[PDB]
C-alpha cells in the first residue's frame with residue numbers, strides 16, 4: 001500500500017526531475033526520517049548527489065560528490081549483486097543480508113573508520129542504501145539516512161526501498177528511451 005502510493009505519485013508526473021523529487025519526498029515522509037537521496041554513479045563509480053529530500057535543517061548534499069575508493073576499486077561493490085547496505089548505527093555496524101533477508105544469527109559488522117568518517121562528513125548516523133539499476137546497468141544508489149540518531153531498519157523497509165529503486169530505474173530507463 002505504501003509502495004502503491006509511491007508508484008502512483010511517481011507516475012503522476014512526467015519528467016525525470018519531478019520523478020526524483022517526488023520519490024525522495026515520498027520515501028522520506030513514509031519512513032519519517034531526516035534525509036533521502038538519489039546518487040548517480042560516474043563512469044568510475046564515484047558519483048554525485050542528484051536529488052534530496054531533507055527535514056530538520058541539515059546541510060544540503062545536492063551538488064556534492066562522494067568519491068568512495070572502495071566502490072571505485074570494486075566497481076560498485078555489493079550493489080552489482082543488488083545487495084543492500086543496512087546500518088542502524090554507523091558506530092556499531094551493518095546488518096548482515098543473506099538470501100534476500102537479514103541474517104539474524106550474525107553479529108553486526110563494524111564499518112571501516114574512513115567509511116564512518118565519510119558518513120560523518122555527510123552528517124549521517126544511520127543509513128539504508130540500495131542500488132538503482134537502469135536495465136542491468138548499475139546507475140546509482142537510493143539512500144535513506146537518519147542524521148540525529150541511530151534508527152533500526154527492518155527487512156520490510158529495505159524491501160520497500162528496493163522496490164522504489166526498481167521504479168526509479170524503470171523511470172530512468174524510459175527517460176533514456
Ligand SMILES: C=CC1=C(C)/C(=C/C2=NC(=C\c3[nH]c(/C=C4\NC(=O)C(C)=C4CC)c(C)c3CCC(=O)O)/C(CCC(=O)O)=C2C)NC1=O
Nearest residue numbers: 039066067068069070077078085111112114115118129143
Ligand atoms: C549516497 C551514496 C552512498 C555512498 C557513495 C556510500 C558509500 C559506501 N561505501 C561502502 C564501502 C566501503 N567504503 C570504504 C572506505 C572509504 N570510503 C570513503 O569514502 C573513504 C574515504 C574510505 C576510506 C578508504 C570501505 C573500506 C568500504 C568497504 C566496507 C567497509 O569497510 O565499511 C559502502 C558499502 C558497499 C559495500 O560494502 O560493498 C557504501 C554504501 N554510501 C552511500 O549511501
